[PDB]
Amino acid sequence: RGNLMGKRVDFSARTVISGDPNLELDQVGVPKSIAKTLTYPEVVTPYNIDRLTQLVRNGPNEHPGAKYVIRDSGDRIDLRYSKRAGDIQLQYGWKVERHIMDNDPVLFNRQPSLHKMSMMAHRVKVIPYSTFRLNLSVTSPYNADFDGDEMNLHVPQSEETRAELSQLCAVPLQIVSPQSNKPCMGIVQDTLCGIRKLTLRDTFIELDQVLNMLYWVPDWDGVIPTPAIIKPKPLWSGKQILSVAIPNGIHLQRFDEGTTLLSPKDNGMLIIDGQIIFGVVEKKTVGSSNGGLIHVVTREKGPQVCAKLFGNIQKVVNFWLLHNGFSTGIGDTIADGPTMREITETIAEAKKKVLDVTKEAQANLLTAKHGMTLRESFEDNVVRFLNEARDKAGRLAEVNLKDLNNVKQMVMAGSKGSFINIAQMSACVGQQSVEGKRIAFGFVDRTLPHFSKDDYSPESKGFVENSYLRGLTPQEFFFHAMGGREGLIDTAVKTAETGYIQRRLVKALEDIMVHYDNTTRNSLGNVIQFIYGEDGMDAAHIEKQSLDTIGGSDAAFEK
Amino acid sequence: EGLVEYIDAEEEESILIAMQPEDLEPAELDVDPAKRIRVSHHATTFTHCEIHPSMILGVAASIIPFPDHNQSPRNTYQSAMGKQAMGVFLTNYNVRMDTMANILYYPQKPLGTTRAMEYLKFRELPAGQNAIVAIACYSGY
Amino acid sequence: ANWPLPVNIRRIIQNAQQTFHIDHTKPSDLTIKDIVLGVKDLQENLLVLRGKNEIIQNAQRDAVTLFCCLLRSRLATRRVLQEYRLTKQAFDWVLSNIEAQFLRSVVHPGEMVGVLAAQSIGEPATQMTLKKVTSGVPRLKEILNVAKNMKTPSLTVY
Amino acid sequence: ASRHGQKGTIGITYRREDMPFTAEGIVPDLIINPHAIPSRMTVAHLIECLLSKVAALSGNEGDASPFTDITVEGISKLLREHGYQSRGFEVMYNGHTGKKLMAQIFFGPTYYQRLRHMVDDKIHARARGPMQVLTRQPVEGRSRDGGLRFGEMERDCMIAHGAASFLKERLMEASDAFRVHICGICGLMTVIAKLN
Amino acid sequence: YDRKVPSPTGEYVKEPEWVLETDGVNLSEVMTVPGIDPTRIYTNSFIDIMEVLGIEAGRAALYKEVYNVIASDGSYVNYRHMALLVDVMTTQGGLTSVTRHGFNRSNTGALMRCSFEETVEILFEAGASAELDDCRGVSENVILGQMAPIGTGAFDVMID
Amino acid sequence: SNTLFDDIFQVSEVDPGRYNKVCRIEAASTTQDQCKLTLDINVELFPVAAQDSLTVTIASSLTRSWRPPQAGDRSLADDYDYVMYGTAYKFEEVSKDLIAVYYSFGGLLMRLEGNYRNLNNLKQENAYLLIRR
Amino acid sequence: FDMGGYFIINGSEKVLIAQERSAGNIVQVFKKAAPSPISHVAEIRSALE
Amino acid sequence: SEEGPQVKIREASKDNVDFILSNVDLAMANSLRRVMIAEIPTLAIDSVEVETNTTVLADEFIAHRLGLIPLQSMDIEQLEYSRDCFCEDHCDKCSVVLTLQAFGESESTTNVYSKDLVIVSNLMGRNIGHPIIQDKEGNGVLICKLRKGQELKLTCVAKKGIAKEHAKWGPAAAIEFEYDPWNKLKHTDYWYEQDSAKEWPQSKNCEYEDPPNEGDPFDYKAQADTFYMNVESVGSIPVDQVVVRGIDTLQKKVASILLALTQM
Amino acid sequence: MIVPVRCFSCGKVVGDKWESYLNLLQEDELDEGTALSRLGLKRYCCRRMILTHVDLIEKFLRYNP
Amino acid sequence: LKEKAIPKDQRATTPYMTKYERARILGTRALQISMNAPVFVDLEGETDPLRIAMKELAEKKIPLVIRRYLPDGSFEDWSVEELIVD
Amino acid sequence: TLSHLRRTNTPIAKPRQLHNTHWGLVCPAETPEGQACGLVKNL
Amino acid sequence: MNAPDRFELFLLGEGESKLKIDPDTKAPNAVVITFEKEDHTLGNLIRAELLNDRKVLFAAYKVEHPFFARFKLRIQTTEGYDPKDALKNACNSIINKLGALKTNFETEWNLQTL
RNA sequence: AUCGAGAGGC
Ligand SMILES: [Mg+2]
Ligand SMILES: [Zn+2]
Ligand SMILES: [Zn+2]
Ligand SMILES: [Zn+2]
């Protein structure tokens, strides 16, 4: 398991990672020193010899360079310590261990290797600083983050090996995931929020901004688009300049909520021939979602156009965001005083419900539903009441939150944020749960020594009325800490359990491949399935299709 | 003098505690909405009152600013980070010869400190700098 | 109505409308015979297996059945002439594009489907984290280890 | 890292002219994304920004102690007394252009920590290198200038791509390829070979 | 349970229906009981469905539970992968565990077998049983350090 | 090369749809009861107050890279105070013998319904819109 | 500022870590598993002082 | 006076000058600010060699501190970049050589202020290399503290430089930039809880510009030609010379571009 | 360890201020903010450098060698 | 054993080149080009062996046969010219 | 330094979870994420 | 360890011209100039002054990477009007404005008395 | 070389 299935390998590297908006998606920011260490064997040919000579002339310590040279006899020549680094004459058929150079095939990997996507071919981009550098859109397949995550790079050593990396393992090829029949990678974080803000109808961009934005697109035609508004002042919608990034011949239709063709909300998306007609770009439009723009461009235009599309969208949207700006503060978490008073009276009404149900239980008047303990029924009622109170207060806060509030804007774009975050940050974090129920009495008939015995009130049982802004009370803090401790324990255990599950799954199905007869088989030859997937189709090619015949009235079907 | 006692976990089961001294006060409306909602204790016959609730936290947690306003896992993470944080570990470092030692050029006392920090000596021997920080989208890096 | 199958008819239809610049007011150039017989011939043209023997031919027909239902639904003579006006050229182009895309969509021999399947189940499981039913990772462990005794056996009665 | 669980690394270093600036000319020492904030609910980080600003202008300390009845509204009242917006938002101008930033930016002093993790120690690269004797495989660790492990899980990942030649070169020529002599009748490497 | 059923006009319409859920499973007895539809009855336990309704029903139930596990988180996996795992368990007569006992026990190559678990016991029994490894399996070639019959290695290449 | 359509409308209502700079406008053609117009308009460039009556025109021209119009030496084709460029997304029949045309001026959305414009306002990439107070 | 609490062995400052353990001479009743011959068990951990 | 950019200096001092940069385009204001921050040359220590160090602080700490110390650079244009002169390592027209020596004779702690630094190099009659002293006491920046029995001796070679190579060579501390105080251009969208006006404090510069009138519409054509600035100097170069030398450095860059075209 | 020469944010020299600031607090019992205002530091970025500083030089001096 | 070969007639394997097939053919051709082998396509500004192999694939000039293998052991041979690339 | 000098290790039916009896006798937050989370706690 | 020397930001390297002029492909009367060892300071001013000229149709500067001190200016002008001439006129206008600013500021400062 | 401990990521 440790020396044959896996082994330490030469020509490997590891480094902390950071992300470059200006780096291309397939490119990887290999640091210069790492390239100086890593060598690829290149046989001298009439086509390359000149460069090779200069490389050997340039030397191992400065890149582009070479560390060693191999003769036909095979005696290595170490350029670092040799009297002959200068006089070398390269006879044909000799080998040069050249440094790793720009636009070379490499492999980039993150150590939880749960995916074919987790190890992907990348193009070398030698860079000054010491960090490995990668595009934002490539984070999702690796699940990488820039908190300090380290990543590994492996250098192919033969032309066939390089060909396999480039022709099968390349980032563009894996853009559509065979799993989940949807793209792996999409627009994330600042690009997403900025794309929403730019696509808004109110967003307009002047000729200076438009001009520099147009230049920022690498494959720009050189034709300035006709302004959306021409008379009072020449003005361009953000949708127009964004369209400049969209390749021609791309059509997208999406209807959500009240998506009238008039679309007052600016909801839904309509794109014709690489131009956007109406809508606001968000995660569903521009993310890894099925039916996403990435899916369409990968399927019609090709993978390379889609990778360049990632790059161009990032460049334009990042420029506009950089000059528009974005921020998040406490005032985003703060909600209106009237809204706060309505939230607190909502919580109080839930408390009144709990007290009345408790008193009815004390009178034994309550009737247990079939199949549950009377105490079980009491717990279910109280838990549901408090959860509903928390959700209602959060929804009240969401209504109060303005369109200017930045947490709302992140939610609308979908980069980060959720309803629960606003609810806990502004209105009520809620009731914590340990092992399934409300907090138990570790002490005798009391959850904490400060509480009286035999108290099942929400305060005793771990419901935290206060919000994070409002400030947790001591008892609330302890109960919250208990819940968080359970969360961390579950995380630590779940990772190990899932690792075992994945290893057993892989070991069971490792032999399974589609043979030339299309029969799914193993080494013994036993046929697991005669046609792979029962249709013999690759799932990345597969997309959602609507079958109109199955649905509808017989009269409508006839008509 | 008997003004204070030492109570273990098993002896606690018999005792009833109040978080605030102000809890043991006569009870009689208009309150600041921003102040955290505190439940009326609805209890009497207190044996004891807690010295300070913040005493439940450890040394690393007492470094954390406003932990009552943050979710617990983040507080745990930071408590793990203070061990990683560089700073002036001791004054005799120049005299001492440790296998490895890291020390900030210009250590700075935090602008916002815990009361407990006084007994932690963190202000006397800090481990961070009060950097002027902007939360913004800029250049995408 | 919505299920995952190869080839997107909607995009092909819009691509035909844009590429050949169809105008709706002009009547079509397509005889009904052409539309119907071409749909049938295209059904004969989408191939997953090549064998001469009848069991392989039946396997091919069985494999392509649902896709052929989708084609017949979307390539309906009333729709092809009314819902989206289609000149003859556009309809032949649609047939050619559908066949080419379908041929591209077939799994390549030599793909390691088992390793990919194991990885494809494993990755979402790592994401799973959190009303009395065994669920999530414990349920998955029970399912994979063919657990004789289950924490939450249950019977739904219809 | 910040005091509220906000880990991070330097993506880039920017000179003062390139950095955004307030009307006072104050330039941020550090830039953090808003996006990291909503998911982790680290409100106290924001509160600390506000309170540290008020303390720096006041010349008095800031009480960040737990279970203290200090309200965001009151600290904001003090900040407004000092002539800044209550929530700490500050009008900022792009350094590259001088154009006003459309979004007012959360600006404030916040305590930050330099963690023990620095890149140049982490950086490692081997190419050809020393080999452990028993396995004939590469040695382990940066300190020994070792070779990174190609995990069996990573090998499965490679199998998913089908790059058999890359896997063989990684697992034979890169690590521990060796030539042995066998006899069919033995079936084992019992052969004694005098090569020269 | 709300259900979708064809209306006489043909459009699918809501069909609310009372449905029972039981703590235990004795399926062989339950289906014969009157007042129920024996066709639609479902047991969450695959083994009881397999013993009562044959192996094919067990395969369907195996898939159904795996799909429910994926769907609770909202995650989606294509039918082919989950199906493939279900087949790997179902094809060899009965449900075969993904454990040492079960899938690892097979006529599969001894080196591939030893790679998972119980390595030395498998190798010892192979020595005693005089098993001969075809070396068709991938793990055998990885141990052999030879290009696996995988992807690019599936087809031999020769001059024209 | 010539004007495709012209009319004079009176605004039924103006609605700021969660936008500070853009208001949706719904208007009825004066002198015609069969023609209605909805249109998203930047109010800051051109204030569009309710109960005002505005002249509206749609022309095919008056492509190559846009250029600033010298010092106005190139002849303005616009006495009107407000002008936009857009492409029509959909053409629909509200009822038989009654047409409706959907235009998009880079995101600001217009709908125009009547039966008169059978021979003009054909589906085209170019449709300049010109509004006079 | 140094507070001690550590030993110096071979010049290395080694600190003793506290170990948690269940108290002796405490009597506790523990329900046996449902599939077990015996229903309940009462356990005491007797150690001299 | 002359047509073009017009300035009106509201208040002035040797450290702070405050003016209104009327009738200029924004790009010029931004570029001038960047040049002032970075591009103006100044003299600062780029080499320290320590013969004796008994101080508790390490040598590199003190070298960084010495680099930060401000020194007079009025005649720095007469001084020549060490990378621009032919000196083997340094010479008198390129470098200014200083030495520092201090012993803790006093039982009390002896401080090392920047006034203790002295010049070994030959000045050749340029106002160069004198440490800036603004303290009322006349003592300089406190470089180090020395107990009795402790001494430090070193030599510092100060060189001409630009802030883009290191922040020490920067001549300006904090430049204040404001335009459109009433936000008539609407260049920023205010973030308001209830009302922007009460929440956002008034700028002082707001009084100079005429207040907005609610009735009038937004002027789309309007662009900002009036800018309000305040320039602060560390004292190595006076404020007036700081702004003028920034102007001249920017125009020199532009002229170099023109000359490069002519060569091409 | 010792008072920074200049604020990291502005670059304004702060090395002149420290001693005076201390004496200003002791001589006239000033409030720390008022002392900062008299010392010419009116921006919180430069103010933090004097408030947050803990002069660890003094302990280092006390060690005899 | 002996002559366990499918006739070229009645071959049922996919006429289209598999991704792995193209990749291995291109890699082998790139290797031989890199080791001083003759090139059967005119080159217009190409020095990379892989780019030469791709151009040759467009020409269909690469002489090689892909031997598709079947679980029964019977082998079907398709020349690069016969195979269809898309 | 201080946290190491005030640390407990429990060698090893729910030890990891924070217990109500752990109120004021150990820190709720301080614990190492990983295999030993909850097993090792600080006073 | 890997960091570039700071002098590269303002010192021209070996074999590097300050300006390199290349015609735009697929765009008429357009040129892309690579300003080496220069920053936003120069590019923004050049672009704005170019915009003030009526003949210039396109003027934009892009910083291909924040790491490297280079910026690209693309210029499109009317036919018969050389973009190089437009650049020269814009730069010279900038210089004249800077000189006028210097003189006016000198006057104002000499009036100032403190 | 073993053993042991501590930290980093998901
Ligand atoms: Mg991470
Ligand atoms: Zn033998
Ligand atoms: Zn010299
Ligand atoms: Zn400052």
Curated annotation (Swiss-Prot), chain C:
Entry protein name: DNA-directed RNA polymerase II subunit RPB1
Role played: DNA-dependent RNA polymerase catalyzes the transcription of DNA into RNA using the four ribonucleoside triphosphates as substrates. Largest and catalytic component of RNA polymerase II which synthesizes mRNA precursors and many functional non-coding RNAs. Forms the polymerase active center together with the second largest subunit. Pol II is the central component of the basal RNA polymerase II transcription machinery. During a transcription cycle, Pol II, general transcription factors and the Mediator complex assemble as the preinitiation complex (PIC) at the promoter.
Modification after translation, per record: The tandem 7 residues repeats in the C-terminal domain (CTD) can be highly phosphorylated. The phosphorylation activates Pol II. Phosphorylation occurs mainly at residues 'Ser-2' and 'Ser-5' of the heptapeptide repeat. The phosphorylated form of Pol II appears to carry, on average, one phosphate per repeat. The phosphorylation state is believed to result from the balanced action of site-specific CTD kinases and phosphatases, and a 'CTD code' that specifies the position of Pol II within the transcription cycle has been proposed.
Family per record: Belongs to the RNA polymerase beta' chain family.
Compartments it resides in: Nucleus
Top-rank taxon, per record: Eukaryota
UniProtKB/Swiss-Prot annotation, chain G:
Coiled coil: none
Disulphides: none
Cellular localisation: Nucleus
UniProt record similarity statement: Belongs to the RNA polymerase beta chain family.
Free-text function comment from the UniProt entry: DNA-dependent RNA polymerase catalyzes the transcription of DNA into RNA using the four ribonucleoside triphosphates as substrates. Second largest component of RNA polymerases II which synthesizes mRNA precursors and many functional non-coding RNAs. Proposed to contribute to the polymerase catalytic activity and forms the polymerase active center together with the largest subunit. Pol II is the central component of the basal RNA polymerase II transcription machinery.
Other observations noted: The binding of ribonucleoside triphosphate to the RNA polymerase II transcribing complex probably involves a two-step mechanism. The initial binding seems to occur at the entry (E) site and involves a magnesium ion coordinated by three conserved aspartate residues of the two largest RNA Pol II subunits.
Subunit structure: Component of the RNA polymerase II (Pol II) complex consisting of 12 subunits.
Protein name: DNA-directed RNA polymerase II subunit RPB2
Encoding gene, per UniProt annotation: RPB2
Residues of the full protein shown: 197 to 245 of 1224
UniProtKB/Swiss-Prot annotation, chain I:
Cross-link (Glycyl lysine isopeptide (Lys-Gly) (interchain with G-Cter in ubiquitin)): 59
CC per GO annotation: nucleoplasm; nucleus; RNA polymerase I complex; RNA polymerase II, core complex; RNA polymerase III complex
GO biological process: nucleolar large rRNA transcription by RNA polymerase I; ribosome biogenesis; RNA-templated transcription; termination of RNA polymerase I transcription; termination of RNA polymerase III transcription; transcription by RNA polymerase I; transcription by RNA polymerase II; transcription by RNA polymerase III
Function: DNA-dependent RNA polymerases catalyze the transcription of DNA into RNA using the four ribonucleoside triphosphates as substrates. Common component of RNA polymerases I, II and III which synthesize ribosomal RNA precursors, mRNA precursors and many functional non-coding RNAs, and a small RNAs, such as 5S rRNA and tRNAs, respectively. Pol II is the central component of the basal RNA polymerase II transcription machinery. Pols are composed of mobile elements that move relative to each other. In Pol II, RBP10 is part of the core element with the central large cleft.
Lineage: Eukaryota, Fungi, Dikarya, Ascomycota, Saccharomycotina
Keywords attached to this entry: DNA-directed RNA polymerase, Isopeptide bond, Metal-binding, Nucleus, Ribosome biogenesis, Transcription, Ubl conjugation, Zinc
GO molecular function annotation: DNA binding; DNA-directed RNA polymerase activity; zinc ion binding
Keyword presence, Glycoprotein: no
Binding site for Zn(2+): 7, 10, 45-46
From Swiss-Prot, chain L:
Cellular localization per UniProt: Nucleus
Effect of residue 108 to G/V: Transcript termination readthrough
Effect of residue 108 to K: Transcript termination readthrough. Lethal
Any GO BP: transcription initiation at RNA polymerase II promoter
Repeat is among the record's keywords: no
GO cellular component terms listed in the entry, alphabetical order: nucleus; RNA polymerase II, core complex
Annotated phenotype, changing residue 111 to P: Transcript termination readthrough
Main location: nucleus
Record note on what altering residue 114 to P does: Transcript termination readthrough
UniProt key word Transcription: yes
Keywords, in A-Z order: DNA-directed RNA polymerase, Nucleus, Transcription
InterPro entries linked to this entry: RBP11 (IPR037685), RBP11-like (IPR036603), RBP11-like_dimer (IPR009025), RNA_pol_Rpb11_13-16kDa_CS (IPR008193), Rpo11-like (IPR022905)
One annotated GO molecular function: DNA-directed RNA polymerase activity
Record's function text: DNA-dependent RNA polymerase catalyzes the transcription of DNA into RNA using the four ribonucleoside triphosphates as substrates. Component of RNA polymerase II which synthesizes mRNA precursors and many functional non-coding RNAs. Pol II is the central component of the basal RNA polymerase II transcription machinery. It is composed of mobile elements that move relative to each other. RPB11 is part of the core element with the central large cleft. Seems to be involved transcript termination.
Subunit structure: Component of the RNA polymerase II (Pol II) complex consisting of 12 subunits.
Note from the entry: Present with 4280 molecules/cell in log phase SD medium.
HAMAP family assigned: RNApol_arch_Rpo11
Annotated family: Belongs to the archaeal Rpo11/eukaryotic RPB11/RPC19 RNA polymerase subunit family.
Gene name as annotated: RPB11
